[PDB]
């Protein structure tokens, strides 16, 4: 579609001065996060240790 250079310059100009230490909307409003989960399998239930295993895709 567009040249690979276009996406490359977009990617390397995305970061610039970002400072991932700070959350989005810091000091303005709480950051709203929407959570999604897909349960691949609920593993064995270990009654002896009072625990159960679970495999998930968490988004």
């Amino acid at each position: 579609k567009v040249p690979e250079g276009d996406v490359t310059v977009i990617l390397n100009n995305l970061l610039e001065g970002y400072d991932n230490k700070l959350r989005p909307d810091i000091g303005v409003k709480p950051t709203l996060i929407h959570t999604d989960m897909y349960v691949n399998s609920i593993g064995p239930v270990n009654a002896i240790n009072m625990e159960y295993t679970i495999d998930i895709f968490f988004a």
Partner: protein, 96 residues
């Protein structure tokens, strides 16, 4: 407001020596500790050990990390701990 936080944090972390404790050469730094026990799992007689999960919190004053002009407490990303001095606390009777 964002750029003010940018400048403040960059100023705070500029010229910071992690190798030196707060108030190096002065009186000792006071560290206030508290714990929140989440569970005690396996008190084993045969092994002579207890497993324990907990939230361990430490508080200490550091003049280098003092800022003004921002009226709110700053919660930074956890990886910033790599750029800061932290006390060398450890648990003496630990096995793992």
């Amino acid at each position: 407001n964002m750029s003010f936080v940018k400048e403040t944090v960059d100023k705070l972390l500029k010229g910071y020596d992690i190798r030196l404790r707060p108030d190096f050469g002065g009186p000792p730094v006071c560290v206030g500790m508290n714990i929140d026990i989440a569970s005690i799992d396996m008190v084993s007689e045969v092994n002579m050990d207890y497993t324990l999960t907990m939230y361990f919190q430490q508080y200490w004053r550091d003049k280098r990390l003092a800022y003004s002009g921002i009226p709110l407490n700053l919660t930074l990303d956890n990886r910033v701990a790599d750029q800061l001095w932290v006390p060398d606390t450890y648990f003496l009777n630990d096995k793992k």
